[PDB]
Amino acid sequence: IDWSTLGFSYIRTDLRYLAHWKDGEWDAGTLTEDNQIHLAEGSTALHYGQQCFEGLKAYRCADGSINLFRPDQNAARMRMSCRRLLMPELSDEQFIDACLQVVRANEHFLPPYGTGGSLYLRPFVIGVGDNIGVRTAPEFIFSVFCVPVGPYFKGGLTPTNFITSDYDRAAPHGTGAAKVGGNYAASLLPGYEAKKRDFADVIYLDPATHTTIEEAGAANFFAITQDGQKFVTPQSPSILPSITKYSLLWLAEHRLGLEVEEGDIRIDELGKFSEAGACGTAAVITPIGGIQHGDDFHVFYSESEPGPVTRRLYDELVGIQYGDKEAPEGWIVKV
Amino acid sequence: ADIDWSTLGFSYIRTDLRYLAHWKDGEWDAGTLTEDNQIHLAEGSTALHYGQQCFEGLKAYRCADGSINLFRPDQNAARMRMSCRRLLMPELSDEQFIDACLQVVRANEHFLPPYGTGGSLYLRPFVIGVGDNIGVRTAPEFIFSVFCVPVGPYFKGGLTPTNFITSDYDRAAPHGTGAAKVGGNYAASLLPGYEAKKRDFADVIYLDPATHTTIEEAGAANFFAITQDGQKFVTPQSPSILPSITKYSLLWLAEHRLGLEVEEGDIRIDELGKFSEAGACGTAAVITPIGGIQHGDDFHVFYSESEPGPVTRRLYDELVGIQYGDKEAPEGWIVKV
Numbered sequence: 001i002d003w004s005t006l007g008f009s010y011i012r013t014d015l016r017y018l019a020h021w022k023d024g025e026w027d028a029g030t031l032t033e034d035n036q037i038h039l040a041e042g043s044t045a046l047h048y049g050q051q052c053f054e055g056l057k058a059y060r061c062a063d064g065s066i067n068l069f070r071p072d073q074n075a076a077r078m079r080m081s082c083r084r085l086l087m088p089e090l091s092d093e094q095f096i097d098a099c100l101q102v103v104r105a106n107e108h109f110l111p112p113y114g115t116g117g118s119l120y121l122r123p124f125v126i127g128v129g130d131n132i133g134v135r136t137a138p139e140f141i142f143s144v145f146c147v148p149v150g151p152y153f154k155g156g157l158t159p160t161n162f163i164t165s166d167y168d169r170a171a172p173h174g175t176g177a178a179k180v181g182g183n184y185a186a187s188l189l190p191g192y193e194a195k196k197r198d199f200a201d202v203i204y205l206d207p208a209t210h211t212t213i214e215e216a217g218a219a220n221f222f223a224i225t226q227d228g229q230k231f232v233t234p235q236s237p238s239i240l241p242s243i244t245k246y247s248l249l250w251l252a253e254h255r256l257g258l259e260v261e262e263g264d265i266r267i268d269e270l271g272k273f274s275e276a277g278a279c280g281t282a283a284v285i286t287p288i289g290g291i292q293h294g295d296d297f298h299v300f301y302s303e304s305e306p307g308p309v310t311r312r313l314y315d316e317l318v319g320i321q322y323g324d325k326e327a328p329e330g331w332i333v334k335v
Numbered sequence: 336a337d338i339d340w341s342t343l344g345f346s347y348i349r350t351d352l353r354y355l356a357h358w359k360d361g362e363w364d365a366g367t368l369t370e371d372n373q374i375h376l377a378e379g380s381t382a383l384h385y386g387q388q389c390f391e392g393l394k395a396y397r398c399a400d401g402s403i404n405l406f407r408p409d410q411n412a413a414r415m416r417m418s419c420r421r422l423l424m425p426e427l428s429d430e431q432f433i434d435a436c437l438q439v440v441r442a443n444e445h446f447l448p449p450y451g452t453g454g455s456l457y458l459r460p461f462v463i464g465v466g467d468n469i470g471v472r473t474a475p476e477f478i479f480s481v482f483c484v485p486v487g488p489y490f491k492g493g494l495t496p497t498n499f500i501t502s503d504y505d506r507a508a509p510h511g512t513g514a515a516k517v518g519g520n521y522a523a524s525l526l527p528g529y530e531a532k533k534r535d536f537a538d539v540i541y542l543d544p545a546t547h548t549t550i551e552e553a554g555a556a557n558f559f560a561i562t563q564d565g566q567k568f569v570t571p572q573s574p575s576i577l578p579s580i581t582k583y584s585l586l587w588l589a590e591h592r593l594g595l596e597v598e599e600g601d602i603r604i605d606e607l608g609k610f611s612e613a614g615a616c617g618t619a620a621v622i623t624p625i626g627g628i629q630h631g632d633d634f635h636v637f638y639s640e641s642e643p644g645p646v647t648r649r650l651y652d653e654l655v656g657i658q659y660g661d662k663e664a665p666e667g668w669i670v671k672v
Binding site for chain 2: 009012016034037040042043045046048049084120126132135136145168169171172173175180181183185186187188207208209218
């Protein structure tokens with residue numbers, strides 16, 4: 001129970017939410033201790049990747065309350081992921097409700113305020129039931145389990161480097177915009193090579209022709225311009241719509257009077273920005289010390305220090321998440 | 336077990352026993368046969384969240400003389416090994432792979448369709464990453480299983496052609512997992528295949544990702560075509576298509592015992608007129624003649640919408656004859672069970 005060292009590893013919490021879909025409708029759903037999934041050997045989820053998931057965090061505020069960050073946004077996104085894979089959808093009603101039931105039942109795992117930790121929720125859907133042909137499963141399972149994670153930066157916003165790859169994580173018109181297992185399995189090998197060559201991860205350029213930046217592994221990418229006034233993130237049908245990215249996209253315009261733009265970010269002109277970063281629920285902005293592309297490295301601001309704008313974005317979001325800052329209208333749901 | 340051999344299609348049927356092996360601490364389990372058709376893994380398994388999974392498909396056939404054939408099992412074990420490497424999963428030697436397949440066939444012989452039913456016993460070997468996990472990383476443990484299902488045709492019973500249509504969607508990236516038999520590629524093909532099926536087409540025909548101008552695959556089979564003079568067998572060569580065992584076998588048969596010239600190159604959809612006949616090939620398909628391909632508003636018919644081309648029949652009759660023991664098997668292709 002030592003929130004101190006605690007990292008981002010699996011830990012068996014008390015209860016999970018579990019719902020079955022059959023004959024066209026979802027069931028009431030229930031809480032279980034099982035933490036073990038059982039499915040037909042021919043399950044579509046094991047052979048054809050008919051699986052998708054979400055990830056969000058719950059936090060314990062100073063005033064003793066509990067914050068659930070934009071659960072609705074994840075519900076909307078998972079609906080799209082299920083859409084792409086022919087799986088039944090879940091309404092904000094059912095999605096948020098399951099997340100709430102799980103946070104409450106496992107409240108004793110919510111890291112106490114002070115230690116930058118939180119409760120990670122892993123909602124997911126998978127196809128099940130007897131099967132061999134390439135088609136959608138006759139049945140599906142929806143589950144939500146949580147695991148207490150600790151502060152990602154057990155020291156502070158420490159920047160790390162990334163490297164370019166010739167491998168793709170998504171096709172131009174594949175499942176890139178959906179949070180489906182297939183995309184992660186494809187990044188698995190290139191990710192192993194990057195870590196090996198002592199790098200944080202890899203930055204995928206773009207299926208068609210590797211000229212523009214897509215995503216920085218399992219997290220979106222953004223860059224502040226030299227003048228430090230304009231916020232830039234890549235726009236593309238093949239990248240995952242990061243909820244953190246969109247929130248950082250908001251905090252920049254309505255909390256930092258900065259210019260904002262969703263467009264192309266060629267790997268030719270990186271010197272066009274003063275600082276760059278990778279954002280995500282787990283990542284929560286990883287300052288990018290430098291990007292290795294070919295035989296030349298390229299640092300933006302520093303390789304041991306986060307740029308100012310980046311730090312401001314980091315602190316504003318973390319503020320909202322924990323409640324030490326007014327939360328925008330809509331975001332944050334009390335548990 | 337009471338099974339209507341005449342009704343048999345391509346659908347899941349619980350056979351008696353499956354093989355199951357566990358990988359722990361860098362080593363593979365001995366391998367064990369079981370009655371349990373249900374798999375049990377950690378709620379956070381890589382196979383359930385990060386698509387860390389790959390599989391194979393091959394058949395066993397009953398011959399006229401009574402013996403049993405397992406078609407090029409060595410090739411599947413080789414391809415699975417390649418798939419496992421792409422997903423950082425432990426490999427399986429040719430020996431382990433075949434041995435598991437033989438045990439399942441022998442333990443389920445009574446499910447092997449009798450010779451002359453055109454049916455067979457389908458084997459589905461696969462490997463999944465399991466064990467408690469949470470971060471995007473290769474699993475700590477894995478499972479290797481082989482179960483079988485008796486079947487008949489996948490698309491249609493007989494050499495009757497069926498039509499295909501192109502799609503703006505991609506089942507794989509130019510430099511993705513197209514070369515490996517992994518779940519993700521099929522997951523992506525779900526929506527397009529569904530739309531093509533909804534419009535009466537057998538399946539989608541995928542073009543090359545980025546600059547959709549060259550034929551890739553059918554989603555469940557490889558694509559091949561014959562020159563207008565019926566002298567050349569042509570099939571797309573791409574780093575993103577699955578290396579079909581049935582395709583390489585056809586490639587071999589066409590060259591020897593069929594006397595055609597062979598070519599592994601590019602086939603743009605705008606030049607379908609260069610071909611007198613076309614087809615889709617695979618273990619499940621065992622050559623499905625392509626009646627006609629739909630591209631936007633153009634519906635191109637190579638030969639017939641109801642009859643298969645003559646070379647296609649020749650290729651078909653040869654490959655199937657070998658599989659069931661009616662024609663001479665080339666060196667090392669058949670393994671007797």
